[PDB]
Ligand binder design. Structure first.
Ligand SMILES: O=C(O)c1cc2c(s1)-c1ccccc1OC2
Ligand SMILES: *[C@@H]1O[C@H](CO)[C@@H](O)[C@H](O)[C@H]1NC(C)=O
Length: 354
């Protein structure tokens, strides 16, 4: 189990002003640290944040969080379940800011909610330095879904923070799972007139203003004022980053299909071509990403699932690919790091989740 610690700086808060926090399991013999960012969509105006507060309150508040959580998948401490990093120091950071980990605003007379995701990450890192992180050799910032996008948005800021604090020996790296989305044309189209009809580019542009959202500096300088929404799309932000980042993305991600207005309920020609083109576009965006794992499956998230070791690309599992990545950062005979399926339809890979 990992144990809850609420932040000592109580000005760094969840949406409703309750303190943010993290769950920790230490491993005294290890200089590796894994910090995992939870996902779970986002909200972008008063009305849709109010509805999320009624029925997804744990994603907006710490008031009802449990004292412990069980580590699963890459957060498991058993080698049977986690061949990659079972002996690491483990940290799970709950997602309670509804801002794709980008916000820097407090609750105030002008703001019903606080959006502090970018500041939560910085405050967790600062408080962990006194609990053993000061001795680390590697800090892997990982995450799934909105947390995977959060890795892309925050990994270089963590590296800069540690350099300015006097810890240049800590190697900061990123692992982004199920957070690599396309701003493509939808299968069916609606103008942004409410929450369900608002496409991701329009919803994120509104969110950034509502959250006071922040993006990495080199990406911000490319796209400039009013266009920072571009930095939430992995294929645009990734080439601006300096830290090493491993990208995990299903070629037919269920959240991508949802935002494209596709619902697989017999598939006719128009939809068959749409799905095949989506897989080809995703593959194209990964061509120049040297550390990547992209199976041809219809699914969502991988790294904290208990059976995460089962899926393989070209005969190599994800825990193996991550180990090969570690070796590469010290090509390798029989230890590959670039693993992207080429077959064109979901479940053409027999190891896909059932
Ligand atoms: O399940 C979740 O947490 C998420 C689903 C999506 C997210 S996060 C997203 C992040 C950036 C750009 C577009 C996006 O649309 C789909
Ligand atoms: C607490 O967090 C706020 C917001 O990030 C920051 O401005 C302030 O310096 C922090 N104070 C301490 C003592 O950590």
């Amino acid at each position: 189990d990992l144990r809850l610690h609420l932040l000592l700086n109580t000005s760094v808060t969840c949406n409703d002003g309750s303190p943010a926090g993290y769950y920790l399991k230490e491993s005294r013999g290890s200089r590796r640290w894994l910090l995992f960012l939870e996902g779970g969509w986002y909200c972008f105006n008063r009305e849709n944040c109010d509805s999320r507060y009624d029925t997804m309150r744990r994603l907006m508040s710490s008031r009802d969080w449990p004292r412990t959580r069980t580590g699963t998948g890459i957060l498991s401490s058993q080698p049977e379940e986690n061949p990659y990093w079972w002996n690491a120091n483990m940290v799970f950071i709950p997602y309670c800011s509804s801002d794709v980990w980008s916000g820097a605003s407090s609750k105030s007379e002008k703001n019903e909610y606080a959006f502090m995701g970018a500041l939560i990450i910085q405050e967790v890192v600062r408080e962990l330095l006194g609990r053993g992180l000061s001795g680390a050799k590697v800090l892997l910032l990982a995450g799934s879904s909105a947390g995977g996008t959060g890795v892309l948005l925050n990994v270089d800021r963590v590296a800069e923070q540690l350099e300015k604090l006097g810890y240049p020996a800590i190697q900061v790296r990123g692992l982004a799972d199920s957070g690599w989305f396309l701003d493509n044309k939808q299968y069916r189209h609606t103008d942004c007139v409410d929450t369900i009809t608002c496409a991701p580019t329009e919803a994120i542009r509104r969110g950034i203003r509502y959250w006071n959202g922040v993006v990495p500096e080199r990406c911000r300088r490319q796209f400039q004022e009013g266009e920072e929404w571009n930095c939430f799309f992995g294929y645009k932000v990734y080439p601006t980053l300096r830290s090493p980042v491993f990208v995990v993305q299903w070629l037919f991600d269920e959240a991508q299909l949802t935002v494209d207005n596709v619902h697989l309920t017999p598939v006719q020609e128009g939809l068959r071509l749409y799905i095949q083109n989506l897989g080809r576009e995703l593959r194209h965006t990964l061509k120049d990403v040297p550390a990547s794992f992209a199976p041809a499956c219809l699914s969502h998230e991988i790294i904290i699932r208990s059976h995460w070791t089962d899926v393989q690309v070209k005969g190599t599992s994800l825990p193996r690919a991550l180990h090969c990545w570690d070796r590469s950062l010290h090509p390798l005979k029989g230890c590959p790091v670039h693993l992207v399926d080429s077959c064109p339809w979901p479940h053409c890979n027999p190891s896909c989740p059932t």
